Write a protein that binds this ligand. Structure first.
Ligand SMILES: *[C@@H]1O[C@H](CO)[C@@H](O[C@@H]2O[C@H](CO)[C@@H](O[C@@H]3O[C@H](CO[C@H]4O[C@H](CO)[C@@H](O)[C@H](O)[C@@H]4O)[C@@H](O)[C@H](O)[C@@H]3O)[C@H](O)[C@H]2NC(C)=O)[C@H](O)[C@H]1NC(C)=O
Ligand SMILES: *[C@@H]1O[C@H](CO)[C@@H](O[C@@H]2O[C@H](CO)[C@@H](O)[C@H](O)[C@H]2NC(C)=O)[C@H](O)[C@H]1NC(C)=O
Ligand SMILES: *[C@@H]1O[C@H](CO)[C@@H](O[C@@H]2O[C@H](CO)[C@@H](O)[C@H](O)[C@H]2NC(C)=O)[C@H](O)[C@H]1NC(C)=O
Ligand SMILES: *[C@@H]1O[C@H](CO)[C@@H](O[C@@H]2O[C@H](CO)[C@@H](O)[C@H](O)[C@H]2NC(C)=O)[C@H](O)[C@H]1NC(C)=O
Ligand SMILES: *[C@@H]1O[C@H](CO)[C@@H](O)[C@H](O)[C@H]1NC(C)=O
Ligand SMILES: *[C@@H]1O[C@H](CO)[C@@H](O)[C@H](O)[C@H]1NC(C)=O
Ligand SMILES: *[C@@H]1O[C@H](CO)[C@@H](O)[C@H](O)[C@H]1NC(C)=O
Ligand SMILES: *[C@@H]1O[C@H](CO)[C@@H](O)[C@H](O)[C@H]1NC(C)=O
Ligand SMILES: *[C@@H]1O[C@H](CO)[C@@H](O)[C@H](O)[C@H]1NC(C)=O
Ligand SMILES: *[C@@H]1O[C@H](CO)[C@@H](O)[C@H](O)[C@H]1NC(C)=O
Lengths: 462, 132, 132, 132
């Protein structure tokens, strides 16, 4: 016998590569709404149905934290947000001296709203008209050089002029499918209860992911896909306290949130052909913005997350605790329900300590025990900590109500010489990346790399 | 796993089968290598790389022989230092992805041999056609 | 109408001639399927679609046989359920455009038959070159 | 000057060698013809032209024959009005560039001979396979 090279095209072999993926919609938005829906106008109208191909005897080395595709989501998000703001009204003329008083004096539930008035430039450049609006105290700051008077300004005039978000734009988290371009493929695990790193034993190709909602939030996730069979705990490295812990849930705890007081919207003309929108009045009662969770189901979830998290810290008792301190954007859970940017105090929610007994203290009888959170609202948001990314959200008339399944908790550990029997887990001020990474952990992209060469014992015709 | 309608239409779907059994599916990969504001530049750049990837492969296949044949013999003997397996391990035991871990060493030696085999053959055929 | 300098250089100029007499003009079409600020994006998308149109045909002809031949035979017998006509009607009465109205039914039956016809040829040649 | 690892990787490097000697090097040119904000339009336009150039060359070579052969004979005799030299000057004395200064006149006469030469062959082959 003797052996001769043969060249084979089309053979199935592959390599890791970084490549620009492209976004594919469910096409439902592609009426007028394609250009109204933030996180859809960049994407193809498609039926991107995830394909059927379990790969058989393959084993593949996935990774959740070293992954690149999360940074493609992050750059695509920022570049699309910033694109959608360019045509909209800059608030530059509105950096005037505001003169203010309280809406009805009294408790913080109503004194949250300042009533403020100012001169506005009409269409007629030489004429200014006196005008008024209601503002939430976080949007406002006292003007200095004065004896503690009624003189105020918008919070942002010393940093950047925000655009009003165009009122046709809708921030609703319509799902994105991410797709591989031609000559690349996406692999996923089917081997659930996966650990975020190491070999995955049951693997499929798909050209496009399932529908991923681009939900931004902190301290909790919302409308995330649930884990398959059990609570899954993931971290880049638990032994470094600086690593986040994604506590991915098996079962949906449910949250309800509301601004129950009844706002009305007024439009203020500013120069030729632009309207600022402001809260004109509160109709009837002043009752506070708040969120409700069934404290029974939440308490079972803090037992079960106690049980699982103890496997990595065996025998030790678990303290939950509040966040350590800072701005609202760091210390409070956050949303965009209806189009309003809530900021809810989680301090009473992550309360108490629970231990290796993990008894079913919730009895099988009926109970209506609700935990409730106090929530601030803001209109000026310095989005994703960008001073130039900032926007003013126009107010929404009527009263907001909003319901959701919840989370994969973004915890951080806190522990040292104090510990002995016990350690503290606190809500964490997550990056945007951490949300999306709790959906994309399943997925890896490869370059197909055909043109294989092998010995076959055959010889050319001459 | 394997079905000739779709196995390589999401690419890759035969890769567990061992090298001899995979060789009946190659067409499904080949026919799938070429499917289809700043996002306009993203799609154009993605498309144009997928074309150049395909043409640079078809050009290498042209220059070595064979011009479009998916499978062909080459008149380059298989060197003793590469010969570390009996043929039946290659065709009947290994997967294509596993075999790549071996022959991903020293590959461009084979491409240099393959190119020059074709030069000498075209020189020889040209004299036969000159007599003919 | 017909003229091999220009008939398909603005395309289609033979379309009424009947199927047999059109067969002499195909080169004029084959040589022309690849002739050549937001307007820059319109032109780049026009160009790259015309390339992908062309290469996808060359990939199909490459897979069924024949690699660049304009005309060839294929070892798929013509089924009675398609055989509704005598050869003289086809080559001497219908136009290519009239013919399309029939065989635009069931076309992917034919492409399944053609691709597998080639696989079995390449397998059978591989054994003979292994014995050679 | 000549060296098969780089001579045409910066292109052109055999251009002084005479036509007979340069003929061993052609592969290095072919394998390099397809290497790889408003500047993105400038790069896409450069790429897309490099692709269509390369494909229009392969399209001609297909239509005349030969679809991937780098060198082939063509059954068009060399007319006396172009035969202004002995073969030994052409292959052993001129450079390819100095030869181009001649047959850059009237080249399209030769393309009309080459294209039509292939038609008559493919018709003739179809009549033989029509008895195979
Ligand atoms: C988690 O998932 C939950 C289930 O999908 C989310 O709850 C849903 O939230 C949306 C938020 O908009 C509610 O949709 C509504 O849409 C109608 C019609 O909208 C159109 O008209 C309005 C003017 O009224 C216009 O501004 C829009 O541009 C549209 O053209 C509105 O009239 C309603 O007020 C309402 O906002 C769903 O009703 C709501 N479903 C449930 C069961 O609550 C939840 O928001 C997700 N969580 C997070 C944090 O996003
Ligand atoms: C919330 O405020 C709106 C705006 O004032 C109220 O809508 C008005 O309700 C009255 C009584 O039903 C109607 O006569 C008006 O025609 C309504 N429209 C407007 C534009 O004024 C609404 O009733 C309030 N709802 C609650 C529950 O407070
Ligand atoms: C939750 O975290 C806070 C802040 O780290 C803890 O609060 C401190 O508790 C000690 C108890 O001796 C006090 O001396 C400190 O003054 C507290 N505040 C600060 C800023 O350190 C709190 O103990 C933790 N909760 C539980 C129940 O352990
Ligand atoms: C605006 O507020 C009203 C009154 O709170 C909401 O209607 C009620 O919803 C709550 C929670 O489901 C119920 O407890 C009340 O009994 C309902 N009251 C009535 C009169 O129906 C209403 O859903 C809110 N509107 C929007 C658009 O969210
Ligand atoms: C806000 O202040 C203006 C001052 O002109 C007054 O007319 C208006 O009634 C006030 N509105 C509320 C709801 O306080
Ligand atoms: C803008 O003004 C507020 C006034 O309270 C101040 O806190 C903030 O530090 C200022 N920022 C800059 C960049 O001047
Ligand atoms: C599981 O995940 C952790 C955290 O990413 C990693 O450090 C560890 O090595 C993994 N262990 C196994 C058995 O996969
Ligand atoms: C954990 O507790 C069990 C039961 O009390 C005991 O046997 C074991 O030694 C303990 N392990 C550690 C690491 O403390
Ligand atoms: C949350 O509420 C507690 C009282 O329940 C209060 O002391 C604390 O300041 C609040 N924290 C934040 C961050 O809002
Ligand atoms: C919450 O989860 C349950 C799981 O069965 C599902 O039926 C329900 O539709 C989900 N609701 C939302 C708003 O996601």
């Amino acid at each position: 016998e003797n052996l001769w090279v043969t060249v084979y095209y089309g053979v199935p072999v592959w390599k890791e590569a970084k490549t620009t993926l492209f976004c594919a919609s469910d096409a439902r938005a592609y009426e007028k709404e394609v250009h109204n829906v933030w996180a859809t106008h960049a994407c193809v109208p498609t039926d991107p149905s995830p394909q059927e191909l379990v790969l058989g005897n393959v084993t593949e080395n996935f990774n959740m934290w070293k992954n690149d595709m999360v940074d493609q989501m992050h750059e695509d998000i920022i570049s699309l947000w910033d694109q959608s703001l360019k045509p909209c009204v800059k608030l530059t003329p509105l950096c005037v001296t505001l003169i203010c008083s309280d809406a009805t004096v009294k408790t913080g539930t109503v004194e949250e709203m300042k009533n403020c008035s100012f001169n506005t430039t009409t269409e007629i450049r030489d004429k200014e008209k006196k005008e008024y609006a209601l503002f939430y105290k976080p949007d406002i700051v006292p003007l200095s050089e004065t004896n503690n008077t009624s003189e105020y300004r918008l919070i942002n005039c010393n940093t950047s002029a925000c655009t009003q978000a165009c009122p046709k734009v809708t921030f609703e988290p319509i799902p994105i499918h991410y797709c591989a371009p031609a000559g690349y493929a996406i692999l996923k695990c089917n081997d659930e209860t996966f650990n975020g790193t190491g070999p995955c034993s049951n693997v499929s190709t798909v050209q496009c992911t399932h529908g991923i909602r681009p939900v931004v939030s902190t301290q909790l996730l919302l409308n995330g896909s649930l884990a398959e069979k059990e609570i899954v705990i993931r971290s880049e490295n638990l032994t470094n306290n600086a690593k986040i812990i994604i506590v991915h849930l098996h079962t949906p705890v449910e949250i309800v949130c509301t601004r129950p007081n009844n706002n009305t919207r007024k439009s203020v003309r500013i120069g030729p052909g632009q309207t600022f929108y402001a809260t004109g009045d509160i109709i009837g009662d002043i009752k506070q913005a708040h969120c409700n969770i069934s404290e029974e189901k939440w308490n079972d979830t803090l037992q079960k997350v106690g049980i699982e998290l103890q496997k990595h810290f065996p025998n030790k008792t678990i303290k939950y605790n509040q966040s350590a301190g800072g701005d609202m954007e760091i210390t409070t859970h956050s949303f965009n329900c209806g189009g309003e940017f809530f900021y809810c105090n989680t301090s009473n929610l992550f309360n108490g300590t629970y231990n290796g007994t993990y008894i079913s203290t919730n009895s099988s009888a009926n109970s209506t025990s609700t935990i409730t959170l106090q929530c601030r609202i803001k209109q000026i948001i310095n989005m994703w900590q960008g001073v130039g990314r900032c926007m003013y959200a126009p107010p929404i008339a009527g009263n907001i109500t909003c319901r959701s399944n919840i989370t994969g908790l973004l915890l951080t550990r806190d522990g040292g010489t104090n510990s002995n029997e016990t350690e503290t887990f606190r809500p964490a001020g997550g990056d945007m990346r951490d949300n999306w990474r709790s959906e994309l952990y399943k997925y890896k992209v490869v370059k197909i790399e055909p043109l294989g060469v092998a010995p076959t014992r055959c010889k050319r015709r001459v | 796993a394997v079905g000739i309608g779709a196995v390589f239409l999401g690419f890759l779907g035969a890769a567990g089968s061992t090298m001899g059994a995979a060789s009946m599916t190659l067409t499904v990969q080949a026919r799938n290598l070429l499917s289809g504001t700043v996002w306009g530049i993203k799609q154009l750049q993605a498309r144009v790389l997928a074309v150049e990837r395909y043409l640079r492969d078809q050009q290498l296949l042209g220059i070595w022989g064979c011009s479009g044949k998916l499978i062909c013999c080459t008149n380059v003997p298989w060197n003793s230092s590469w010969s570390n397996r009996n043929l039946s391990e290659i065709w009947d035991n290994m997967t294509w992805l596993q075999w790549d871990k071996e022959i991903s060493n020293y590959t461009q030696i084979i491409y240099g041999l393959l190119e020059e085999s074709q030069n000498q053959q075209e020189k020889n055929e040209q004299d036969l056609l000159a007599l003919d």
